[PDB]
Amino acid sequence: LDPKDPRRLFEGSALLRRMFKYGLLSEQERKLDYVLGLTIHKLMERRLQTRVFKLNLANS
């Protein structure tokens, strides 16, 4: 879409806002183009599993 598309401007932002609530992109990574460079390895790390362990809350 055009960079000033009523749609993009709204859905684009909201998609990002969601990448933020789940913390996949850091504050300083707004621009949509970044939505793509997302490792499945990164999205895997934000799981109750990957977290409980990386929170020294488990032995493994």
Partner RNA sequence: AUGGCAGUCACGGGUAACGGAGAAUUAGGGUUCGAUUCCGGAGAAGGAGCCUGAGAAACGGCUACUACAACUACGGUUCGGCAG
Partner RNA sequence: AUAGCGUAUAUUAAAGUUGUUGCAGUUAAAAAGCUCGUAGUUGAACUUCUGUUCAGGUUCAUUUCGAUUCGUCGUGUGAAACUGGACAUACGUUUGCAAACUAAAAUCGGCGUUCGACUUAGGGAGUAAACAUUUUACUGUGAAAAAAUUAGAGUGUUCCAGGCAGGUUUUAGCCCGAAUACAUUAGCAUGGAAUAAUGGAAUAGGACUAAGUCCAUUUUAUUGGUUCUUGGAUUUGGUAAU
Partner RNA sequence: GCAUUUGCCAAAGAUGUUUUCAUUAAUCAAGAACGAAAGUUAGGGGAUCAAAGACGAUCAGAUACCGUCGUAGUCUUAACUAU
Partner RNA sequence: GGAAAAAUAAGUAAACCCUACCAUUUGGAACAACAAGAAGUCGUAACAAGGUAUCUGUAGGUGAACCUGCAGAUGGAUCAUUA
What's at 29, amino acid-wise? E
Query: What number of chain residues touch RNA (CB under 7 A)?
Result: 9
CA 1 to chain centre: 21
Residues 5-34 close enough to bind another protein by CB under 8 A: 6, 9-10, 13
Which of RNA, another protein, none has residue 2 at its interface (CB below 5 to 8 Å by kind)?
another protein
Which of another protein, RNA, none has residue 30 at its interface (CB below 5 to 8 Å by kind)?
RNA
Distance in angstroms (rounded) separating the CA atoms of residues 60 and 57: 9
**Angle 37-40-42 (CA atoms, 0-180°, nearest 5)?**
80
Catalog residues that contact another protein under the rule CB under 8 A: 2, 6, 9-10, 13
